[PDB]
Amino acid sequence: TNINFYKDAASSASNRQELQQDPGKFTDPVKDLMVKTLPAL
Amino acid sequence: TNINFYKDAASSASNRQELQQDPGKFTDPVKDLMVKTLPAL
Amino acid sequence: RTVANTQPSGPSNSKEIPALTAVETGHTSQVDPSDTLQTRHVVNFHSRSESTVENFMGRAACVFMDQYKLNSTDNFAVWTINVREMAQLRRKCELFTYMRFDIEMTMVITSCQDQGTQLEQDMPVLTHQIMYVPPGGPIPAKVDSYEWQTSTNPSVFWTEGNAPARMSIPFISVGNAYSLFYDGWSHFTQDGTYGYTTLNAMGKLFVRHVNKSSPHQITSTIRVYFKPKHIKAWVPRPPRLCPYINKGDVNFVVTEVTDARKSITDTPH
Amino acid sequence: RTVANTQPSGPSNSKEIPALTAVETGHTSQVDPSDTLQTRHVVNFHSRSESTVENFMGRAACVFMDQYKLNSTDNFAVWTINVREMAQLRRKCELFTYMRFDIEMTMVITSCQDQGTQLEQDMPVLTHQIMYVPPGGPIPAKVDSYEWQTSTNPSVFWTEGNAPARMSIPFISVGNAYSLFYDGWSHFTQDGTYGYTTLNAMGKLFVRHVNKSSPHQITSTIRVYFKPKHIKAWVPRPPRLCPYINKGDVNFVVTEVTDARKSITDTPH
Amino acid sequence: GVPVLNTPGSTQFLTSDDFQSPSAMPQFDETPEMHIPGEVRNLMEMAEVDSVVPVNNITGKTKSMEAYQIAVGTGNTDKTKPIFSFQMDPGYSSVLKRTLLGEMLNYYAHWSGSVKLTFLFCGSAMATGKLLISYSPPGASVPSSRKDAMLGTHIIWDIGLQSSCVLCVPWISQSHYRMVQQDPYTSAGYITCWYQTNIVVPPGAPTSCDVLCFASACNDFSVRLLRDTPFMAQPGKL
Amino acid sequence: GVPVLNTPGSTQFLTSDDFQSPSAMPQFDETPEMHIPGEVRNLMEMAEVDSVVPVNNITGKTKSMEAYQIAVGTGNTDKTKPIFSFQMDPGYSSVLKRTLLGEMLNYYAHWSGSVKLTFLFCGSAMATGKLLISYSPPGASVPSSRKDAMLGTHIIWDIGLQSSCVLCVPWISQSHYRMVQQDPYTSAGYITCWYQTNIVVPPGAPTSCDVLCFASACNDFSVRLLRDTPFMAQPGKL
Amino acid sequence: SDRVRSMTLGNSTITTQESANVVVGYGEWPSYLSDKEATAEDQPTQPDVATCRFYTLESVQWEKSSPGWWWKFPEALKNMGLFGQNMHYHYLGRAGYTIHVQCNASKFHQGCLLVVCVPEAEMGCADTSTTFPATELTTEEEPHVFTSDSITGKKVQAAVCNAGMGVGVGNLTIFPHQWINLRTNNSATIVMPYINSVPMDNMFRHYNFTLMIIPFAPLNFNEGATAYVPVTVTIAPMYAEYNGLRLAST
Amino acid sequence: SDRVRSMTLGNSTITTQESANVVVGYGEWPSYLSDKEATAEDQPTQPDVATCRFYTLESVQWEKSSPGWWWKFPEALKNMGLFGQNMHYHYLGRAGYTIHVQCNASKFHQGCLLVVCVPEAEMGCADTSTTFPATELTTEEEPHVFTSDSITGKKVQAAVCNAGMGVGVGNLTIFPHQWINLRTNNSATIVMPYINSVPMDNMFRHYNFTLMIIPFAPLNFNEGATAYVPVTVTIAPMYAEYNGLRLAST
Ligand SMILES: CCCCCCCCCCCCCCCC(=O)O
Ligand SMILES: CCCCCCCCCCCCCCCC(=O)O
């Protein structure tokens, strides 16, 4: 299952069950918050 | 994991997770304690 | 972990103008189909799985194919270890400037039994030593040199006919990430090696036959497959449209932005 | 388990003189970069892992390569079991005078199928008996002698084409450590065998083909790889700069202290 | 020892396998991780971010910068003709195949989600006009009249201070996941831009203004089946 | 029995594997362990301990004892010239490659930490002088003037009763781990010793005094990627 | 309003009346290197205003036929004040650059600039076999212009369509990007933090990023409009920290 | 002060006015073999002062051209009091030696001696093929001098650069080492405990360690200074325990 049989951390199965996502790094990189429901100016 | 499947102690995985270190055997072998913040004389 | 569900929408005549944005801001609009148009409440059970960089790099791809023979420098295969040798995984890794990935190499080795005048002598199962020399380490010059004594260099010593050899490699870059793209010269005088070749110097991989010799020439092909795992992509990049020309530099031949269509209004079918 | 973090420092004009030490004391200065110079608070997540003697010896390296044939004393390979035969692991083991390590031998055996006039006969999978005769035990003289009956001698009986044979060996030295360096004569008259050969007499390793004979000569190469584990290094030594000449003595040809540079002020690049 | 029966999948190198393997260098102290800005934990993040698309990919213009430029003019001629037209599916459509969502689509075989095309009017500040950007769902012919495009999903872009209207294709599909490869079953709709009103310009402003289309992925967007990209072709060893 | 699927790493001899193996002699009574003084549980301990370095490795002097001897003199000639100069990186620098830290560095591919060079004045007890031992971080030319060395990291060694000043290179690197092998990217700085003041000697003391440099590892020092040492070359069977 | 902006990094200040929101590089604001993420043990030189100020580079005329320009930072900041001096006198340097590209155009000017900070924009040689010299890509004095078509020789592939890195220029918006559309914007500010694998790198051998200003819509103005439309890059390093004082490198 | 020292092991005492801190061998003080770590069942003979005293060996003149000397202990202590007598009359012996090398030089003398106790310094033969006799390495009466260059014959490789063990002499500081720098030190004391794999070993066949005194900086004195600068080794075994009373071996 998820048991790691090798002591080294790199010698483990890929973390394919991690679906963390932060698109705001690329889609919303502006300093001032931009709301879609207001003019962008 | 860390389970030993062989009865003999030598027939076990290497203790690669032990990072014990005592450099004072070689770097500080003097009988009288030497502090870096005082003259060595 | 599923993607955001399409919220129900309706007719709207307001000053919100969700569709009206500004690309001048550099911010991609966070609008949804419910914003611009009128959409039904759709619960999106679709998930951004297999699109994760962890899952995307999970697919193991070849990075090094070479032919080393049994019975000079052609009896063992030398690999300056870089993902850029094979274009298939290189473009995947070149989607991000920095990737902190524990790389899982899975060597696939198949003997060829080169066509010769005499091939009636059957050699026993060929063992293969895939030694890894760290950068600056002793590089072997012969198939029987002292470097093959793996006092410190890791080596699978894989035997043919068994499961393909696989030795997971940790993150070994001197920096905090693997710079797939590095617009920097090797020397501070800004003269030398420009590109990823500078920072991505992760040693060499020497592949040989543990068997001393064979009655007839056998040229086993070492097909190294690199599976990145525990990846930390840090600066995304577009795929390289141009075909890869050099494995030590980003040098490229100019290529069209896209497949040209007959007209700006040309819609097939 | 990480190394000590670089403590923050600042300008100082005091009588502490951390830089001013005395090598006459024989004590290496415990100074830090914060002491001599002014350094920022750097949390050193770097760890002295893979530098541990346990991890350093963890890399398995060859110690014995020999060619024993199928179809006299050339049909089986005899190894006076010592780490010093191969220079790669010998210098690692010679970094310490005494190492109490449980040694993990991993025999890698590859058949060669010696080039002859006739090699059209295919022999079945070759089984290999790697017998260990303890010091003073019965040493075989033929490939079919009674010594090969392993009543007490451990033997893997490895078959070709499978996973490489591996039999972990405990600490078998008569003393409390393996004296890699032993400036002592075998006899109390101070005449005899000088060096590690005296104390490091850990028996012999006889490698043979379990198969009685083959239609054509097959010379399998036994590549013994020694992986020390549970190591207890006890007296550190410098690496031997001079190349190894004898496998039974430290005898050496004189070698330069380092690679000579053009001048005391010669700094390349 | 323990009785173990090898499954028929033993001793195989499956490319997409979550199998633990022995470490090449055990207890290797990896360089400490630092917070490098922009951590990509999913490539649908780089799909979501805008990307200028080569709408005007007519022969020769792909080499130059005019591939992305969508030409508009203050001329009565061809006003009843689309400003542009192309296929919605980013997988195989010439316009959208090499863009950020498309490039992260041809690395996959199935795609689902709402493509949003942000249209930036790169013309004179006093150049005001109304466009009709319309996604027509498949099953019918490509819109040849502005009324036909209006019958499908559409947004009127009143060019002004914002200067960027986002046409969000509302995932009008008969299946949960359209196929990236060109197949008529999961064939997407047609994105066509027309003139709802001419691009009225003052006498001192150029008539031949330019428009840039930014095809971007919404939060709905996902890809399901990975595949080697057809774009990256390697003729031989580099 | 138990269904077992062999991973693609099965039946391989990885050198750096933590795999348990059957005992050659089961229940073997190992000789009882005794507290032998100096237990090395890490070779960075032998790196940390001082080691005379061959600073004066000019041709021929490596054979003799003058390789370690750093010559200093009470002469106005060549006072504006470095006492010595060499590369900081112990991996490939000729001076530091065969020393304790360097020898325990070429057994590895990556190295990180503060090298500390303890300089012992092996001259007359009344021979007093001021030296300027300077580590210059890379990115610039090797210091050719004492001012250039002063612009980098430096310590003034006032030779006296202590007679040993430790120049601790404060790990001025752009990466968490410099590479032991010679590569310009992780190329280290330059350690140069100059005369801050002449080595003033009484008339009864020799002018040509000697200095010994002890390159030692600090507590920060670590090595990350093991590799076979290039120094130990075996031409054939011993 | 969002159109007005004012950045007072250091002595120099930039005030704009039509400037969209500033593109923080990848959503993370630049900051000094933390002790957790620091690998150099030298005391960091941190001039808060001596080096962290707006440096106005050479203004390049945005011609109708101009395909694009690129600046290679921080090497483009050589001979530019105490930031360049600290570059010369330090082995390792880290800085978060809030580039501000000023393109003052009237309301009758048609054009659009993708001002994009591409981290580690490895440039391709015009001839793939060879490698271009440092002068071809370095931007010490003047921006290096992207060519409209393919060029040959020991130079940098300046094909604007491939952005010089074999990468689709329209996809360059994947990197921190801001658009100067003369319809709306006359200036773009990208606050790009220090972006590199190593926490601190030399500022000469390695260019932390490249500011590529790509006119996607070429400048289009009718007769009588100002023909000299300048594209002025005003880049201000922020939280600039240097380790490894050494001899000046030239 | 740390420079003054006084060691009163046994009847003989050593008092020094310029002597740095004594180098306890590998940080562990010598002691009698504990019952836990003992493998010999004979009653241990433990002369507290009869054998555990300072024995002053032959003083060797430190010439300008002297490359080095070595003493092989405990065999160098043969014919030296009751320690040597107990060596002769016992099969197994253990001792922790606090060697004290005395090099009295004026303030006008330039030189430095690496006085290093190398445990199990296996010496290399001058001709690699053969093995040297016992006389070549044994130090019963006079120190065996390291040659400045390579020598040949059935002797010990005395190349000072290789320390006779194929090992970098500058790296010999890895073993318990003290420096006699005539600038500061005139005497070095190394309290080396019993260092061997076996808890007790014969004192003739096996040399527990070798005291190598290597002049790294050769003795340099102007005319009029004392030319006969002696290097006098005064080694005191501590906690000396012997098992296996037997016929005297000669
Ligand atoms: C056979 C056991 C050891 C295996 C070592 C081989 C792999 C070495 C490490 C590769 C690092 C990642 C690839 C190069 C860097 C990059 O460009 O991302
Ligand atoms: C085949 C099963 C039995 C295997 C026995 C072979 C290994 C014998 C023990 C080796 C001890 C360590 C090596 C010699 C001593 C040394 O010099 O360190």
Residue numbers in the entry:
A (entry chain D), B (entry chain D): 28 to 68
C (entry chain A), D (entry chain A): 6 to 76, 81 to 278
E (entry chain C), F (entry chain C): 1 to 238
G (entry chain B), H (entry chain B): 10 to 259
List sentences quoted exactly from the publication behind this structure:
Echovirus 18 (E18), as a member of enterovirus species B, is a significant causative agent of aseptic meningitis and viral encephalitis in children. Echoviruses belong to enterovirus species B (EV-B) of the Enterovirus genus within the Picornaviridae family, which are single-stranded, positive RNA viruses (~30 nm) without a lipid envelope (nonenveloped virus). We describe the mechanism for the entry of certain EV-B serotypes by using FcRn as a two-in-one attachment-and-uncoating receptor. Protomers consist of the capsid protein (VP1, VP2, and VP3) and the smaller internal protein VP4.
Detailed characterizations of mature E18 particles, the E18/FcRn complex under physiological conditions (pH 7.4), and the E18/FcRn complex under acidic conditions (pH 5.5) were performed. To investigate whether soluble FcRn could induce E18 virion uncoating in vitro, E18 mature particles were incubated with FcRn under either neutral (pH 7.4) or acidic (pH 5.5) conditions at 37°C, and the virion morphologies were then compared by negative-stain electron microscopy. When incubating mature E18 particles with FcRn-decorated liposomes at acidic pH, the particles are first bound to the liposomes and then transformed into empty particles and released from the FcRn-decorated liposomes. The rotation of these residues further displaced the pocket factor from the pocket of VP1. Accompanied by pocket factor release, FcRn dissociates from the virus particles, and the unstable virus particles initiate uncoating. The density of FcRn around the particles was observed and compared to that of the complex at pH 7.4.
